[PDB]
Amino acid sequence: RVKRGYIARRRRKKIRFFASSFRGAHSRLTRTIAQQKIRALVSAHRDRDRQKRDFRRLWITRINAAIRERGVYYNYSKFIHDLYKRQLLLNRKILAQIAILNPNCIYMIYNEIIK
Amino acid sequence: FRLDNLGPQPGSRKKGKRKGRGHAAGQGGSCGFGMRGQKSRSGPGIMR
């Protein structure tokens, strides 16, 4: 009742096709194709949570570098002082996006934070 | 009733669990017998 099969080769060929552009025996050699599928997926996990964290960090330092161009000592903390006292609910650090896509509009943002 | 449309009721025949066929199946690896001892080795084992 012999049971020679082919399902390991489709099982294995799917993982073989996912492991393209892995520079060498991480892209050809099955017994490393498996663990590069595995380590590639957990790399996708931690780099996804830390792409949320990392783009948060990037917008913080980008709008900090935008506000510090005034010359007078107005930090990023004081922009949030007078960004929540003057009631602006949650611009979500997308003013770090229109701070470079619309620099006159972020000058209107900050020049209305002053008043 | 045709030869086609016959089927047993649910709960009448469970599937026999196969051991050592994957850890997602439930009893993979050491097949549900811990690590070592007489309970894991193959043979008559222990007199009841």
Partner: peptide, 28 residues
């Protein structure tokens, strides 16, 4: 090890036009 997947139920929206905005101008 756990292979699960996730298809986020998203919605594409096309924009028509913006109106109702003619109060307190703040030009510089």
């Amino acid at each position: 090890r756990r292979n699960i997947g996730h298809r986020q139920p998203i919605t594409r929206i096309k924009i028509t036009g913006i109106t109702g905005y003619e109060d307190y101008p703040a030009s510089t």
